[PDB]
Amino acid sequence: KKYSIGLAIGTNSVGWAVITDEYKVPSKKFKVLGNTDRHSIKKNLIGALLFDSGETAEATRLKRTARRRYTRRKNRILYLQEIFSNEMAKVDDSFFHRLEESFLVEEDKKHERHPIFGNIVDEVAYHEKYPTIYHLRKKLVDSTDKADLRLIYLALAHMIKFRGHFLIEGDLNPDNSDVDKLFIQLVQTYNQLFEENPINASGVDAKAILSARLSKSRRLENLIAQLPGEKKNGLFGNLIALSLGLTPNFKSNFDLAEDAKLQLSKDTYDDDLDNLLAQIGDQYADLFLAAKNLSDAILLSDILRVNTEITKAPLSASMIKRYDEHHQDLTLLKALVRQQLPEKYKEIFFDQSKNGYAGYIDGGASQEEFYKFIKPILEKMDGTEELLVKLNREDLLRKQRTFDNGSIPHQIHLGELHAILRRQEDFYPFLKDNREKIEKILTFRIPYYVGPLARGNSRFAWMTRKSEETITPWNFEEVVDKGASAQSFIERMTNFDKNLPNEKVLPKHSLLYEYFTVYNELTKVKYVTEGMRKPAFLSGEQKKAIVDLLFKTNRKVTVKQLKEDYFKKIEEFDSVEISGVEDRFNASLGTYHDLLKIIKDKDFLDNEENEDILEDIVLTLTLFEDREMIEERLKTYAHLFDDKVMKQLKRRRYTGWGRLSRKLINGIRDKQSGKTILDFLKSDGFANRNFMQLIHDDSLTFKEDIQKAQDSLHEHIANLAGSPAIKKGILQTVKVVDELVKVMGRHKPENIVIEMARNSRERMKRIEEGIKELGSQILKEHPNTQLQNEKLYLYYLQNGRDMYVDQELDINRLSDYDVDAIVPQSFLKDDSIDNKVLTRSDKNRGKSDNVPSEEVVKKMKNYWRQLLNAKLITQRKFDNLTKAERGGLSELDKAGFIKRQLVETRQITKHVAQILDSRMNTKYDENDKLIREVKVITLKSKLVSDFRKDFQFYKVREINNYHHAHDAYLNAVVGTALIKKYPKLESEFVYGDGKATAKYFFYSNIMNFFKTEITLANGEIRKRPLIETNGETGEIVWDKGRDFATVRKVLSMPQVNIVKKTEVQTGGFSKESILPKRNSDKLIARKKDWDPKKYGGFVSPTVAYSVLVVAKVEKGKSKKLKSVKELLGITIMERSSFEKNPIDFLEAKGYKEVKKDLIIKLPKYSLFELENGRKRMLASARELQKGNELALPSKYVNFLYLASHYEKPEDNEQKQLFVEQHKHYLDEIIEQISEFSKRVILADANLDKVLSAYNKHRDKPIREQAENIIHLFTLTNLGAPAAFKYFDTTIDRKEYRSTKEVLDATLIHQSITGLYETRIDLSQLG
RNA sequence: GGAAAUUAGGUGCGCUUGGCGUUUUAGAGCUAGAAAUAGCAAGUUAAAAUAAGGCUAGUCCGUUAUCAACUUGAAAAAGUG
DNA sequence: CAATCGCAGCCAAGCGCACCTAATTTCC
DNA sequence: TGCGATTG
Ligand SMILES: [K+]
Ligand SMILES: [K+]
Ligand SMILES: [K+]
Ligand SMILES: [K+]
Ligand SMILES: [K+]
Ligand SMILES: [K+]
Ligand SMILES: [K+]
Ligand SMILES: [K+]
Ligand SMILES: [K+]
Ligand SMILES: [K+]
Ligand SMILES: [Mg+2]
Ligand SMILES: [Mg+2]
Ligand SMILES: [Mg+2]
Secondary structure (H helix, E strand, C coil): CCCEEEEEECCCEEEEEEECCCCCCCEEEEEEEECCCCCEEEEECEEEEECCCCCCCHHHHHHHHHHHHHHHHHHHHHHHHHHHHHHHHHHCCCHHHHHHCCCCCCCCCCCCCCCCCCCHHHHHHHHHHCCCHHHHHHHHHHCCCCCCHHHHHHHHHHHHHCCCECCCCCCCCCCCCCHHHHHHHHHHHHHHHCCCCCCCCCCCCHHHHHCCCCCHHHHHHHHHHCCCCCCCCCHHHHHHHHHHCCCCECCCCCCCCCCCECCCCCCCHHHHHHHHHHHHCHHHHHHHHHHHHHHHHCCCCCCCCCCCCCCCCHHHHHHHHHHHHHHHHHHHHHHHHHHHCHHHHHHHHCCCCCCCHHHHHCCCCCHHHHHHHHHHHHHHCCCCHHHHHHHHCCCCCCCCCCHHHHHCEHHHHHHHHHHHHHHHCCCCHHHHHCHHHHHHHHHCCCCCCCCCCCCCCCCCCCCCECCCCCCCCCCHHHHECHHHHHHHHHHCCCCECCCCCCCECCECCCHHHHHHHHHHHHCCCEEECCCCCCCEECCHHHHHHHHHHHHCCCCCCEHHHHHHHHHHCCCCCCCCEEECCCCECCCCCHHHHHHHHHHCCHHHHHCHHHHHHHHHHHHHHHHCCCHHHHHHHCHHHCCCCCHHHHHHHCCCCCCCECCCCHHHHHCCCCCCCCCCHHHHHHCCCCCCCCHHHHCCCCCCCHHHHHHHCCCCHHHHHHCCCCCHHHHHHHHHHHHHHHHHHHHCCCCCCCEEEEEECCCHHHHHHHHHHHHHHHCCCHHHHCCCHHHHCHHHHHHHHCCCECCCCCCECCHHHHHHCEEEECCCCCCCCCCCHHHEEEECCHHHHCCCCCCCCHHHHHHHHHHHHHHHHCCCCCHHHHHHHCHHHHCCCCHHHHHHHHHHCCCCCCHHHHHHHHHHHHHHCCCECCCCCECCCCEEEECCHHHHHHHHHHCCCCCCCCCCCHHHHHHHHHHHHHHHHHHHHCHHHHHHHECCCCHHHHHHHHHHCCCHHHCCEEECCCCCEEECCCEEECCCCCCEEEECCCHHHHHHHHHCCCCCEEEECCECCCCCCECCCCECCCCCCCCECCCCCCCHHHHCEECCECEEEEEEEEEEEEECCCCEEEEEEEEEEEECCCHHHHHHCHHHHHHHCCCECCCHHHCEEECECCEEECHHHCEEEECCCCCEEECCCCCCCHHHHHHHHHHHCCCCCCCHHHHHHHHHHCCCHHHHHHHHHHHHHHHHHCCHHHHHHHHHHHHCCCCCCHHHHHHHHHHHHHHHCCECCCCEEECCEEECCCCECCCHHHHHCEEEEECCCCCCEEEEEHHHCC
16 A cells, blocks of 8 residues: 545645545544444545634734833833822822722722812812813913922823823924014025025915915915915925925926935935035025924924914913814804704704714714714804814814824923923922933833843843843933843844854945955956957956946946946957946945945045954944944044044944855855955956855865754744744644554655645825825825725726826726736736736737737836836836836746746745655665655646646535545645656656746646647647556556546545634633623623623623533522533633632532533534534534535536536537536535535524525526525535525524533544544433 | 845834723703603813733733643653554 | 624834845856 | 624
8 A cells, every 4th residue: 555645735724635546535444432332433535624714923912012001101100109109198198099099989989089189169170270181281381380289290190191202303392483484584595596586475474374284285285376486396395395394306306317305304314415415516505404494393383283482381272272162163063053953953962872062072973973974064054164164174173182192292291291390399399309200201211122121031021131120210221231132132133144153144234245245246247358259257456446446436336337437448448348247236335435425534444454343333333223322332433533423423324134244254264275255256366256156166165164064843833934824734734644644554655745825005005105206186086995996906006097008098997998917827827916907908918928019118118117116016017017128028938937837936835845855754875865755746726726627627615615625635646647647847846856949838738648639729639548658667647547537536525524623712801892881790890899880891701612511500599409511611811710720610600519520621613413413513602603514416516617607618618508408406406405404504594595595586597596506505614604695685694502402412522634533422421 | 946146025023102992980060840851051171991910020921823532741742543 | 582683992103133025147 | 703682
């Protein structure tokens, strides 16, 4: 007995099958364990393991971060209360107590129910005077009176608890006063530079236009509209856009040859502005300087809507402005509706269930839902004009705590906090002594490069401490070693050099690393002129001159530069041809030119004695992100540099790391020559060996020194790159193989054939930015979920224009258009947007075989470049559209694409093959060589997909889960037959160890040996005999006389081992919504002492697993003991306490005299068999899932495939006639579903509705009936019931919301393959 | 089948932050009526919680991965037809 | 009991490293 | 899709 294994690896399934050399699946008797009548059972060696999707760690990570921030937000308040503690005890010794118990009902409170003052008259008067906390905040900022210490605390705590963001660096000092004066100064600055065409201010209310509650682009339009003759994209318009915070492009303003984009917020602005001024001149400096001055006065116009001269709390005053205008408009809205719509007053102001004002304040109506409900009511009335204006600006009846408050920087809250401290420290000395302490509570942010402030019990932490003591926001710099922590942050993640594993890789922007990349590319450049017979390398003397002249003067070196400014102007070559570099060199000395601008000392950079210092500087600039820590690490070099360059050097920050170490490129030396790798790249006689040749040359010592420098199965797979969903199936695949090997008596298989299976928010954002750079108004002309349509998505990505013809596209005629593939689908199976365009007709592309024709590229390339700059097409999409001008698809390209259709190239699939190969092949030769006992073959899905369709082994996925197992069987058959027929293909499919046209036709007809007659692509008919053999062997590969019948017999076998992986449920305890209190006791307490009948709580806890309990419970008033057998759900929250002491946990639930040895742990999907073969799976402790599979005969599967594809060659008429000749199969398929449902589904109401729905459409076309019959299998599918539709009839799911019947059924414990079973008759228990 | 560089597009893991929401309580509802109710007034804010909790007591940890049964084992895992 | 209807925490910012695919140049 | 609530 020799055998092979077929495998189909998916995200939710692993199909498997064992075949013999006759392509047959064996059957075998397996022992059955347990206490039932059955001692053994026959099983076919074919099946599929099913499992729920494996999840990434992202959701767990976001919740872990949220917990840390709630812990730290609470500590900020605790820090503040500790500071107030001693003095607050003298004012009100129970104030903080009332704050902590504010949530408790009055019955549970220990102090008086009014938290602030402890009595009702004082509490009522507070809210009367300060209706919002911002009323109190502004008053404490602007008033000189001594304030109650309790009100001081509440205002400071409110700023510290909700402190604002940290997206702006440095200090913020808002100043509203000079918006008009600064705009006039920018106009005056602009007119002095363009006296010929000045701009008239002329009472243009710049303060109103720029500070208005509109978008930056909208206010830019309103300002430009007030200036006749000025365009929005003109020079003055871009300056206004710059002051607003946009990203204008000054390229067209100055007729530049490159983009000149500027935005003041990016740290690159100072360099970018200097780059622009270097081209246009320094007389434009005051132009952008005055633009920055105006930008500071309107920087906070979105959040600060009050003139800053009358208050030092403009944020709170802006909130007060919201409150007052809310009061004024509410009084006006109420008086209006009383007069004009008195009937709808109750619904608008009393009905919480409606989206009126009541639902806005008391119900669940959002601000957006409230505006939508009230807008038609406002338009019906008069006069609501100003209310309509405020509504469309989202400024009507506004609250103060709103979704859009995220734009408020922490410096704003800090300003008000600092002012309150300054006011009240004159009366409270402890506020003076603790002023900077309190401000530090608000401003201090744990650096992201420090991480959690742990002390040995965090697997996520890396921080180290200077001193062993508790870390506070005030001693953080002294207790935490920021330098070591910031270094460990990067050090724990960066690669080591694979060639020298003990050596870290160099920074990507290291000078020595960029020298390495330049010389490695330079050393393979050849040249030829009219005199020399054959091309020659560049000499070591030539490389140095080329580097010194071109690379050290220009950031990029073009091939034209090399030819013109070197070979001609220094070598006396009137002409020269260059090979090894195209257009321009890929490598460059970018860091060399960055430092040359900063330190201005070219001699210092070219002095190789300064090599170690420059590598240390770049290492510091790469390792650290805090520019103060950077400045501290550059102190040892403060004598070579003045203070001006040091200020520029500490701003030059780098990111990224290279692939090689400094010891590899310029450290280790060849023993004979004493030269490093970089030395050989600089000069290597006339051989000019590059990096790959040097470390592989057996005549040098680099190769042996690198060779001299050179995990469980679960950890290895987890550490692989790829989706954690496919990685779950990879581990299960290995476990299936291990079991299948032991099933075959631990004999290894001959072959293992593996095959691995192959939004709306991003689409909208990608189009809005694209048309913005495009300048088009197509989004405004014809305005998310609609972009799920493929054609409409391509329509907007192409600005409503044809990609092949340069003509407009009618958006209401998208059905008349064609979605054509850039690279034809016959070569590349790319269904993504990167390979699709929208055109009037696919004939506009040109020929069908190749890339769009030359005439199309010459006419449309300009249009494609604009779409590329607007990020509407990727660089890959632009490259393959313009490929015709580069010659188009070569004959080797077409063959390469057709080999890619057969040979799997994904790295993740190669890892699976390597894992199986290394686990199977472990013995060695007499010469210490690996003995490959098992060939691991990798196939792509198209090979079996085409095999199914050629020979009518059709697949209908909705019928059952057998298709996963059948795919694995077909993988083994096709894979082993292909390797047996053509052993030379083992180099392409087996892991380990003219001509273009031939390889194209060879790879195109590689599967023809299965057929008897072949109609070729050339049109010529070929014939093959019945039995196929191997060339040199003569062994029989395929017998078309009985091997197809073998496949038909295998695929028609009803007994297939479908196994749903039982799994303990993990994750959140329950649903997260905090529901209001209800007398129903389903609610779960949110804290230990928060009775949900008083405080509300959670619903629907998740059961981790169920347990079978055989015990007694107390019944009735007398508490009689009554023997019971029950299924108890152990929730995720309860799991730890249950497992710590099961008996104590069960006794606490009310069970007595528990049979401890009869407790069975029953995770989700636990399998039970009842009567007549009916099976049920545990959905939980209180619901069951369907446990049976409907094995529909093969003749019905093939009929359902052809009849449903009836609308979609000359032989298609034979398949169409088969459908009409077997229209009676519809009744027979319904009968199969009915008998199956009556036997195992037991949903008579839904079956009657199904049969009634089938009879109503018996005159419908056979295609439509077959399509809807496929929907009916949802009724019979394995797993959780789900709704489905037969034509227009909807059949809602019939759930099995009772688990009592399984308590006396047969529990089935299945191995991973389902071949080994332990069956427990639970009726004997109890 | 690999390596480096360049260009472009993605994925994973980890850290540090912001704003909402929701829950209970506080923000004296008034007049009439025996009451059911009716007519008005009012509404924008805050505290506290945001997995129960844990010991290791940290400004730490608490939702990923992994899991038939039986025997062994803390676990990982091994053995069993 | 069943048949039936209802419900589910979300939005945003910054940073670091490591992978992957897919084109080009030079090589093993 | 597991379960809470409502209706029949
Ligand atoms: K009380
Ligand atoms: K204008
Ligand atoms: K609301
Ligand atoms: K609400
Ligand atoms: K709120
Ligand atoms: K190039
Ligand atoms: K850095
Ligand atoms: K899990
Ligand atoms: K899960
Ligand atoms: K199992
Ligand atoms: Mg907590
Ligand atoms: Mg809130
Ligand atoms: Mg937050």
